[PDB]
Amino acid sequence: DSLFPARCWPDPCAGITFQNDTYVCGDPRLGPVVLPQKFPLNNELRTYARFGALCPAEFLDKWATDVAPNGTYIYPPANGFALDTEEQPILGNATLPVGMKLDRFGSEYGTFLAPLGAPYIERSLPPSNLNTFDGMYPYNYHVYQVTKEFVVGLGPIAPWFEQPGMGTQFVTYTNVLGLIDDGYLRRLDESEYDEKVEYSNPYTPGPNQ
Amino acid sequence: SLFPARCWPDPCAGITFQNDTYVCGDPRLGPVVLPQKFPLNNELRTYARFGALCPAEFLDKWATDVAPNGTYIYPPANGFALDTEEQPILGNATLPVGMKLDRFGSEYGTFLAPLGAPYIERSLPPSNLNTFDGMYPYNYHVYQVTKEFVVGLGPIAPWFEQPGMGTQFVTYTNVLGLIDDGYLRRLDESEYDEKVEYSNPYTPGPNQD
Ligand SMILES: NC(=O)c1cccc([C@@H]2O[C@H](COP(=O)(O)OP(=O)(O)OC[C@H]3O[C@@H](n4cnc5c(N)ncnc54)[C@H](O)[C@@H]3O)[C@@H](O)[C@H]2O)c1
Ligand SMILES: *[C@@H]1O[C@H](CO[C@@H]2O[C@@H](C)[C@@H](O)[C@@H](O)[C@@H]2O)[C@@H](O[C@@H]2O[C@H](CO)[C@@H](O)[C@H](O)[C@H]2NC(C)=O)[C@H](O)[C@H]1NC(C)=O
Ligand SMILES: *[C@@H]1O[C@H](CO[C@@H]2O[C@@H](C)[C@@H](O)[C@@H](O)[C@@H]2O)[C@@H](O[C@@H]2O[C@H](CO)[C@@H](O)[C@H](O)[C@H]2NC(C)=O)[C@H](O)[C@H]1NC(C)=O
Ligand SMILES: *[C@@H]1O[C@H](CO[C@@H]2O[C@@H](C)[C@@H](O)[C@@H](O)[C@@H]2O)[C@@H](O[C@@H]2O[C@H](CO)[C@@H](O)[C@H](O)[C@H]2NC(C)=O)[C@H](O)[C@H]1NC(C)=O
Ligand SMILES: *[C@@H]1O[C@H](CO[C@@H]2O[C@@H](C)[C@@H](O)[C@@H](O)[C@@H]2O)[C@@H](O[C@@H]2O[C@H](CO)[C@@H](O)[C@H](O)[C@H]2NC(C)=O)[C@H](O)[C@H]1NC(C)=O
Ligand SMILES: *[C@@H]1O[C@H](CO[C@@H]2O[C@@H](C)[C@@H](O)[C@@H](O)[C@@H]2O)[C@@H](O)[C@H](O)[C@H]1NC(C)=O
Ligand SMILES: *[C@@H]1O[C@H](CO)[C@@H](O)[C@H](O)[C@H]1NC(C)=O
Ligand SMILES: [Ca+2]
Ligand SMILES: [Ca+2]
Ligand code: NA
């Protein structure tokens, strides 16, 4: 393991402007120095090489507008859905059933979720989505459960940010907070997603029903 | 917990013993011994193999019979998730050279997932963890694309008491054929035992010209 690929030593942070010691190389775009060590977060991050095989400045050079602190991450086209052979996004409008569990790295003003437990690398997220903004939600990780059916854009996640992607994303037409407001999602606390059976599916009916 | 606590005292009630080393002596219920090492143990960390059901309940719901002659019933539309009009969500997509895929199953089949996808994201029955070739414990195979080729690519519908919602790659030619024609190569476990080997070096960064 370790924070950087072995090639990056002895100066892995060369080219990075230090800003704040909470983050890798002092740069919030490179995510937090400290990573989760409890289930399920550690399970979702077990396959996560933060910069792939790149070093920090190469990673920022590739995926952001500038290695300097003013550089912003560039996001994939077509809302990050994987593209078919004709460059069109693969997705469909789909009804999320009551009982389905969803999770998300990001504030509740966002519109992108994944099925509960998807690996971080399946989400094609940059390292900064693991930064903590509310101490009640370390690593900006939120878990929800569908309390009333609603329709979302549903489809595969394109590779991005030096990761393979290919999770499924749910792109909502109301942001998360709005969906909670209107009774479509409820928040789950950690006791509701800390055992294996709580990842299983009781709501989908069988073929013989 | 192998069985949900609700199934005690006698979880194997209704199951006919057939073969030892399988849960309740029934190969449809998968092996007793589950994988002990990364990445397989990472892929099964969220797997409750019957959900909240007891073995006979699970077979009654998902197979044609609890008796040994029962066979698992599979989801329609080749297991793709369905949109609000009951059409499968998928597109034809080019898999790029370098992409890593994996699969629980034999090389005569056609369904793969992105390397590292959780077992519950694949909506597979317990018997896809059965070992048929000691060279491949749990029938777990990993591949890398060596020449680009087109697959059906889409979200995985929930089935078998699991949420699904990984992405599946549905090949037009079985795995063995694709290896033989030079589209896939087999990976040794040494080639997927480190986090960096799950990252993506082949997808290019956005154009900034
Ligand atoms: N296996 C995974 O890891 C996986 C990844 C992503 C998604 C999925 C999910 O798998 C589900 C399908 O399961 P199934 O066992 O049918 O897959 P697979 O093993 O690839 O087989 C495909 C078809 O090819 C035929 N055939 C396969 N072997 C032989 C053989 N030795 N001899 C003769 N014919 C054979 C047969 O029609 C079979 O149904 C589907 O619902 C899908 O959602 C799994
Ligand atoms: C690094 O900066 C943070 C402040 O960052 C802001 O607040 C975060 C919650 C998040 O919104 C970031 O994106 C923001 O840029 C410092 O956090 C403060 O730390 C002081 C410690 O003296 C503490 O008193 C305050 O409570 C913190 N402020 C907030 C708003 O939480 C942090 O200390 C900085 N790191 C270092 C090493 O100084
Ligand atoms: C599971 O076992 C069966 C054999 O039947 C079981 O074992 C007996 C010793 C006895 O205890 C029975 O009551 C059990 O039900 C295997 O089926 C045999 O397979 C071989 C090789 O393929 C074949 O030559 C025999 O004809 C088969 N016998 C029958 C009755 O079909 C079966 O292969 C085992 N399955 C697994 C996954 O191990
Ligand atoms: C598939 O098998 C079931 C169950 O078979 C019985 O139980 C097994 C464990 C073993 O002991 C078999 O030899 C048994 O016949 C069949 O279910 C029927 O179960 C009823 C229950 O009242 C019993 O009366 C019958 O005799 C069985 N039916 C027959 C013999 O026609 C089931 O029929 C089998 N599969 C199909 C497609 O019918
Ligand atoms: C995806 O493309 C297939 C056809 O792709 C060709 O055939 C495959 C077997 C494989 O060799 C590919 O590399 C080829 O490019 C479409 O299948 C056709 O669909 C139409 C209408 O749905 C049907 O009438 C044709 O007979 C199908 N062809 C075959 C050979 O079955 C498929 O529709 C495409 N899927 C999407 C979502 O665009
Ligand atoms: C972004 O900022 C660049 C200059 O940043 C400064 O120089 C670099 C080398 C670092 O030392 C950094 O800490 C400094 O703040 C500009 O050259 C560039 O044009 C700016 N980008 C935009 C889009 O304006
Ligand atoms: C999904 O629904 C939204 C809102 O109703 C609509 O704007 C969009 O075109 C639909 N997309 C598909 C693929 O049906
Ligand atoms: Ca719990
Ligand atoms: Ca290795
Ligand atoms: Na070096």
Numbering used by the authors:
A (entry chain A): 26 to 234
B (entry chain B): 27 to 235
Question: Could you give the paper's own sentences about this structure?
Answer:
Here, we report the identification of NADases on the surface of fungi such as the pathogen Aspergillus fumigatus and the saprophyte Neurospora crassa. The enzymes harbour a tuberculosis necrotizing toxin (TNT) domain and are predominately present in pathogenic species. Interestingly, N. crassa NADase (NcNADase) activity was not affected by either EGTA or Ca2+. Both AfNADase and NcNADase cleaved NAD+ and NADP+, but not their reduced counterparts, NADH and NADPH. The absence of ADP-ribosyl cyclase activity from the fungal NADase was further substantiated by its inability to convert the NAD+ analogue nicotinamide hypoxanthine dinucleotide (NHD+) to Nam and fluorescent N7-cyclic inosine diphosphoribose (N7-cIDPR), a reaction specifically observed for cyclases. These results demonstrate that fungal NADases are pure NAD glycohydrolases as they lack both cyclase and base-exchange activity.
To understand the catalytic mechanism of AfNADase and related NADases such as TNT, we attempted to solve the structure of the enzyme in complex with NAD+ by soaking the crystals with the dinucleotide. However, due to the fast conversion rate of NAD+ to Nam and ADPR, it was not possible to trap the substrate in the crystals. We therefore used the non-cleavable NAD+ analogue BAD, differing from NAD+ by the substitution of the nitrogen atom in the pyridine ring with a carbon atom. The structure of the complex clearly illustrates the binding mode of the substrate to the active site, and many of the residues are the same as those involved in product binding. The interaction with BAD includes two water molecules; one is found in the same position as water I in the structure of AfNADase bound to the products and the other, water II, makes contact with the proximal ribose. In the complex, F137 makes contact with the proximal ribose of BAD positioning the scissile bond into the active site. The benzamide (nicotinamide, by analogy) is also held in place by hydrogen bonding to R129, F130 and R148. The sidechain of Q194 makes contact with the 2” OH group of the proximal ribose. We propose a mechanism where water molecule I is hydrogen-bonded to the in-ring oxygen of the proximal ribose, the nicotinamide moiety, the phosphodiester backbone and R129. The nucleophilic attack is further prepared by Q129 which interacts with the 2” OH of the proximal ribose and can potentially induce a δ-negative charge. This mechanism would resemble a SN2 reaction with the formation of a transition state, in which the attack on the α-face on the C1’ position from water II coincides with the nicotinamide leaving and the formation of a partial oxocarbenium ion (oxonium intermediate).
